[PDB]
């Protein structure tokens, strides 16, 4: 059973959906997550290409990779915000951005902030000659797609 | 546009992986230490995608397979002089691939052609491996091979 963190959204060339669950145990373990035991759930981004999409060559539909994807977290009526740095990796429904998440502030309503980076430019490239090549290209600043109202309250499972 | 095959695609572990030649390109950023669109003889692309066996390790079928670390190596035959050639990951107008700008240094002829497939680095990817929503296979630890003993080089076929 996987919870929707809200409505998926469309920003850019990307379509991005939120979901949270169980914590999971990831191999290798990723940055400085909380392990399965220590973590209150495992988030994650689905970032596919949209129709927009096709202008960087992507096909609608196809995972977009190589993304930098960082959450930030602030429960309403508190001025902290807690940073998460997800990761790239495979549940078995394929690759995706996750991370495992101790919400820091505890039970609550938060606004949840994917910011989302291109590539960096020693790690990816687009052919841009006439012949072969695409018309679009990467954003500069991060694309968002925000959630307002999140409601933690506890696993749900 | 036009590619023209290296040779037959390939299936190694779970990668299904297909090498093309066409045309030397323009790419940004300009890919690492490659030749510009002027100073290459030719582009070449590995076209990698998970196959049945990639299943258990959460890939779609069919699909690509990004953070791999490729590598290509060309040697003509008869000769010593083996050329390494790492690949970038790189969009065209048909998708993500992984690919170069390249010389061949020795000429015209016949080359050996091999593309060594390393599984992504330690920091770069992770599996989910709890029994609930994890994959029940895991990354190779030696380099997959993708390759074909007598590609032949006879110039631009454009
Ligand atoms: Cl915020
Ligand atoms: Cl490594
Ligand atoms: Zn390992
Ligand atoms: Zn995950
Ligand atoms: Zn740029
Ligand atoms: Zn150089
Ligand atoms: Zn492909
Ligand atoms: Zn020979
Ligand atoms: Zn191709
Ligand atoms: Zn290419």
Redesign the interface.
């Known amino acids: 059973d996987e919870f929707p963190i809200g409505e998926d959204r469309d920003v850019g060339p990307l379509h991005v959906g939120g979901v949270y669950?169980?914590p999971?145990?990831?191999?290798?373990?990723?940055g400085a997550q909380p392990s399965?035991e220590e973590a209150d759930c495992?988030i994650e981004a689905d970032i596919h290409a949209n129709e927009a999409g096709k202008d960087?060559?992507?096909?609608v539909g196809?995972?977009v990779?190589?993304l930098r994807v960082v959450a930030f977290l602030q429960k309403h009526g508190s001025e902290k915000v807690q940073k998460v740095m997800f990761?790239?990796?495979?549940?078995?429904?394929?690759?995706h951005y996750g991370a495992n998440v101790k919400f820091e502030e505890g039970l609550g309503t938060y606004k949840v902030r994917f910011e989302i980076a291109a590539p960096s430019?020693?790690?990816?490239?687009?052919?841009?000659?006439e012949?072969?090549?695409?018309s679009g290209?990467f954003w500069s600043e991060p694309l968002v797609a925000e959630w307002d109202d999140f409601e933690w309250k506890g696993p749900q499972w």
């Open positions: 669950f169980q999971v145990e990831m191999h290798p373990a990723p399965k495992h960087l060559g992507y096909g196809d995972f990779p190589y990761a790239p990796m495979n549940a078995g429904d394929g690759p430019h020693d790690e990816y490239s687009l052919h841009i000659d012949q072969t090549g695409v290209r």
